[PDB]
Amino acid sequence: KTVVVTTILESPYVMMKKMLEGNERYEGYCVDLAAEIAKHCGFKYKLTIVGDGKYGARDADTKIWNGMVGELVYGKADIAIAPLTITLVREEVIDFSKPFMSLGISIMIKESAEDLSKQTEIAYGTLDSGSTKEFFRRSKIAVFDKMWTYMRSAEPSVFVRTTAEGVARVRKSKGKYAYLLESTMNEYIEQRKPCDTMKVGGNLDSKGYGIATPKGSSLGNAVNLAVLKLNEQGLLDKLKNKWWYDKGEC
Numbered sequence: 365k366t367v368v369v370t371t372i373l374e375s376p377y378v379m380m381k382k383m384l385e386g387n388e389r390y391e392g393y394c395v396d397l398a399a400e401i402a403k404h405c406g407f408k409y410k411l412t413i414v415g416d417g418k419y420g421a422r423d424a425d426t427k428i429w430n431g432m433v434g435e436l437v438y439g440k441a442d443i444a445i446a447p448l449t450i451t452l453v454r455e456e457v458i459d460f461s462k463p464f465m466s467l468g469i470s471i472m473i474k475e476s477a478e479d480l481s482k483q484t485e486i487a488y489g490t491l492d493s494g495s496t497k498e499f500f501r502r503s504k505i506a507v508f509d510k511m512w513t514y515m516r517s518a519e520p521s522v523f524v525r526t527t528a529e530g531v532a533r534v535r536k537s538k539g540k541y542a543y544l545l546e547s548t549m550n551e552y553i554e555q556r557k558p559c560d561t562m563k564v565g566g567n568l569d570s571k572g573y574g575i576a577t578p579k580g581s582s583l584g585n586a587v588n589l590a591v592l593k594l595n596e597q598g599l600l601d602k603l604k605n606k607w608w609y610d611k612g613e614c
């Protein structure tokens with residue numbers, strides 16, 4: 365009947381409109397994407413913000429998945445539409461549609477990863493949890509392995525808790541702090557006032573964000589075909605351009 369969609373606040377994907385109720389309280393790339401996939405697939409839905417404010421990781425002790433991934437695995441949500449990075453660990457427990465948006469870990473400064481690894485004057489870090497941190501932690505690639513060893517033992521801490529915190533740290537560090545984040549957030553922030561940040565070098569890896577559903581879900585097939593169709597029509601490119609560039613501030 366009414367499909368339960370779990371999502372999360374992260375600009376410009378899902379934001380509180382700056383007096384409203386239900387789905388109309390929200391706006392952003394993922395809000396527009398949810399309406400488009402629902403329209404194509406022919407379903408009614410309710411957007412809900414994930415209670416724990418997490419994307420999805422499996423606790424090492426309890427082995428239970430938290431965040432949006434957890435909501436899908438334990439049957440609390442029917443679908444997740446947000447900047448949820450497609451990773452192998454998540455793919456083992458949930459299904460992802462083809463990418464609706466491409467990205468890679470990138471560097472934000474006020475070059476290359478190899479260049480950051482060989483130096484010591486500019487400090488660098490990632491979020492204290494998430495796919496970016498996990499990529500560095502489990503990487504068997506020499507340069508990233510070195511970067512991780514440096515980040516985990518750096519004092520004071522080079523890690524931050526939110527995107528906003530990583531961005532602010534870059535802005536106030538006089539070129540002494542580089543933030544490692546997904547290229548999509550990097551591109552978005554570059555077009556946000558005070559317009560003083562920049563992406564440098566190529567991405568460290570390659571992946572995307574995908575619509576997620578519980579394993580064996582009936583909705584899976586349909587949502588995947590919808591993503592392929594919206595992509596083919598150029599709609600996803602227009603939608604990214606709308607939220608990143610048309611609404612840019614620089």
Ligand SMILES: C=C(C)[C@H]1CN[C@H](C(=O)O)[C@H]1CC(=O)O
Pocket residue numbers: 374419420447448449491493494495496497527544545546
């Ligand atoms: C915004 C957050 C915390 C998310 C977005 N995609 C990643 C994920 O799905 O884990 C996280 C960012 C990152 O790890 O750099």
